[PDB]
DNA sequence: TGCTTCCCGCGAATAACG
DNA sequence: CGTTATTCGCGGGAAGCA
C-alpha cells in the first residue's frame, strides 16, 4: 500500500510509508502521497510548470491572471492571496483577520474556472 | 526578515456508482 | 437519477528562500 496506521489513545494516525509524515485523515495522506509517486500530474495551463497537488496549481494559475480576490474591508485595497491581505491588515490596520474577523471579503474566482463555494456569493 | 510557497484538517461541490 | 465516494478550495500557521 502507501501507508501504515498508528494508534495512540484510541486515536488513529495514517503514516506515509515513504517520509513517515502523520495524517489524521486518510484523504490527506493520499493527497500528500502524490508528491512521492507523481501518479497524477497538475500542469499549469499558462506555462510549463507542473504541480503534485491540484490546489498548488490553482494558486499558481491565479498569479497568471492577476486576479485580486482578497479585499480589505477597512480601506478597500485588494490582494492576490490571504497572506498579503493578512499582512496588510495587521500592519496598516493593527487588527487580526483570524477567527471570524469580518475584516476581509474573499470574492469568488472569476478569472479562472474553479469550483465555486456558494458561501462566497 | 519580508516576501513566497507549502501544508493539512475540514467539509462543500461534484464525479462515480448502482 | 439518489447515494456514496472522491476531489480540492479554504484558513492561517509553518517552512523555505534570498
Ligand atoms: Cl480583480
Ligand atoms: Zn510522504
Ligand atoms: Zn504557470
Ligand atoms: Zn486596508
GROMACS .gro file of N, CA, C and O (backbone and C1' of nucleotides) in nm, chain C residues 1-17:
model
  118
  140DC     O5'    1  -3.288   1.360  -0.990
  140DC     C5'    2  -3.203   1.286  -1.077
  140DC     C4'    3  -3.238   1.138  -1.074
  140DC     C3'    4  -3.209   1.068  -0.941
  140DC     O3'    5  -3.324   0.997  -0.896
  140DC     C1'    6  -3.102   0.953  -1.123
  141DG       P    7  -3.406   1.050  -0.769
  141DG     O5'    8  -3.293   1.101  -0.667
  141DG     C5'    9  -3.314   1.093  -0.527
  141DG     C4'   10  -3.268   0.958  -0.474
  141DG     C3'   11  -3.190   0.963  -0.344
  141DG     O3'   12  -3.194   0.835  -0.282
  141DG     C1'   13  -3.044   0.907  -0.519
  142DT       P   14  -3.155   0.818  -0.127
  142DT     O5'   15  -3.001   0.776  -0.130
  142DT     C5'   16  -2.964   0.645  -0.171
  142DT     C4'   17  -2.814   0.632  -0.189
  142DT     C3'   18  -2.728   0.684  -0.073
  142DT     O3'   19  -2.634   0.584  -0.037
  142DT     C1'   20  -2.648   0.767  -0.279
  143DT       P   21  -2.586   0.567   0.116
  143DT     O5'   22  -2.426   0.559   0.104
  143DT     C5'   23  -2.365   0.474   0.008
  143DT     C4'   24  -2.239   0.538  -0.046
  143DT     C3'   25  -2.157   0.615   0.058
  143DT     O3'   26  -2.043   0.539   0.109
  143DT     C1'   27  -2.169   0.728  -0.155
  144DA       P   28  -1.941   0.455   0.016
  144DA     O5'   29  -1.888   0.557  -0.097
  144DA     C5'   30  -1.847   0.503  -0.223
  144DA     C4'   31  -1.744   0.591  -0.293
  144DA     C3'   32  -1.613   0.616  -0.218
  144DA     O3'   33  -1.504   0.600  -0.309
  144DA     C1'   34  -1.715   0.824  -0.275
  145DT       P   35  -1.354   0.642  -0.271
  145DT     O5'   36  -1.337   0.785  -0.339
  145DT     C5'   37  -1.339   0.796  -0.480
  145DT     C4'   38  -1.321   0.941  -0.523
  145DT     C3'   39  -1.188   1.005  -0.484
  145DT     O3'   40  -1.120   1.046  -0.601
  145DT     C1'   41  -1.372   1.149  -0.434
  146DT       P   42  -0.979   1.121  -0.592
  146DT     O5'   43  -1.018   1.275  -0.608
  146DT     C5'   44  -1.104   1.312  -0.713
  146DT     C4'   45  -1.135   1.461  -0.708
  146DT     C3'   46  -1.014   1.551  -0.692
  146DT     O3'   47  -1.028   1.659  -0.783
  146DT     C1'   48  -1.171   1.596  -0.520
  147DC       P   49  -0.901   1.748  -0.827
  147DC     O5'   50  -0.913   1.877  -0.734
  147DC     C5'   51  -1.032   1.954  -0.735
  147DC     C4'   52  -1.036   2.044  -0.613
  147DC     C3'   53  -0.904   2.116  -0.582
  147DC     O3'   54  -0.930   2.247  -0.538
  147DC     C1'   55  -0.978   2.005  -0.393
  148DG       P   56  -0.909   2.374  -0.635
  148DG     O5'   57  -0.988   2.488  -0.558
  148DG     C5'   58  -1.129   2.485  -0.551
  148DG     C4'   59  -1.177   2.555  -0.425
  148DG     C3'   60  -1.096   2.677  -0.382
  148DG     O3'   61  -1.187   2.767  -0.320
  148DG     C1'   62  -1.080   2.510  -0.213
  149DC       P   63  -1.143   2.916  -0.283
  149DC     O5'   64  -1.107   2.906  -0.129
  149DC     C5'   65  -1.210   2.905  -0.034
  149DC     C4'   66  -1.153   2.878   0.103
  149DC     C3'   67  -1.037   2.970   0.142
  149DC     O3'   68  -1.085   3.071   0.230
  149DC     C1'   69  -1.005   2.740   0.210
  150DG       P   70  -0.986   3.179   0.296
  150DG     O5'   71  -0.950   3.115   0.435
  150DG     C5'   72  -1.051   3.075   0.524
  150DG     C4'   73  -0.991   3.026   0.655
  150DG     C3'   74  -0.894   3.122   0.722
  150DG     O3'   75  -0.901   3.105   0.861
  150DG     C1'   76  -0.778   2.925   0.659
  151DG       P   77  -0.863   3.225   0.960
  151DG     O5'   78  -0.709   3.200   0.995
  151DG     C5'   79  -0.672   3.083   1.068
  151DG     C4'   80  -0.527   3.049   1.042
  151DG     C3'   81  -0.430   3.171   1.047
  151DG     O3'   82  -0.312   3.131   1.111
  151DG     C1'   83  -0.395   3.050   0.857
  152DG       P   84  -0.264   3.202   1.246
  152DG     O5'   85  -0.152   3.102   1.302
  152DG     C5'   86  -0.184   2.967   1.328
  152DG     C4'   87  -0.075   2.874   1.276
  152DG     C3'   88   0.069   2.919   1.302
  152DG     O3'   89   0.146   2.804   1.342
  152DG     C1'   90   0.038   2.879   1.072
  153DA       P   91   0.305   2.812   1.363
  153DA     O5'   92   0.363   2.737   1.235
  153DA     C5'   93   0.317   2.609   1.202
  153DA     C4'   94   0.402   2.547   1.093
  153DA     C3'   95   0.552   2.566   1.109
  153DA     O3'   96   0.618   2.450   1.063
  153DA     C1'   97   0.481   2.667   0.907
  154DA       P   98   0.775   2.428   1.086
  154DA     O5'   99   0.834   2.433   0.939
  154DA     C5'  100   0.761   2.376   0.834
  154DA     C4'  101   0.815   2.425   0.701
  154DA     C3'  102   0.967   2.446   0.697
  154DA     O3'  103   1.017   2.389   0.578
  154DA     C1'  104   0.857   2.641   0.624
  155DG       P  105   1.174   2.373   0.552
  155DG     O5'  106   1.197   2.461   0.421
  155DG     C5'  107   1.099   2.459   0.318
  155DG     C4'  108   1.122   2.570   0.218
  155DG     C3'  109   1.269   2.604   0.191
  155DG     O3'  110   1.287   2.623   0.051
  155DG     C1'  111   1.153   2.798   0.256
  156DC       P  112   1.433   2.612  -0.015
  156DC     O5'  113   1.462   2.760  -0.065
  156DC     C5'  114   1.358   2.833  -0.129
  156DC     C4'  115   1.389   2.981  -0.127
  156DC     C3'  116   1.538   3.016  -0.131
  156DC     O3'  117   1.562   3.111  -0.233
  156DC     C1'  118   1.428   3.136   0.038
   0.00000   0.00000   0.00000
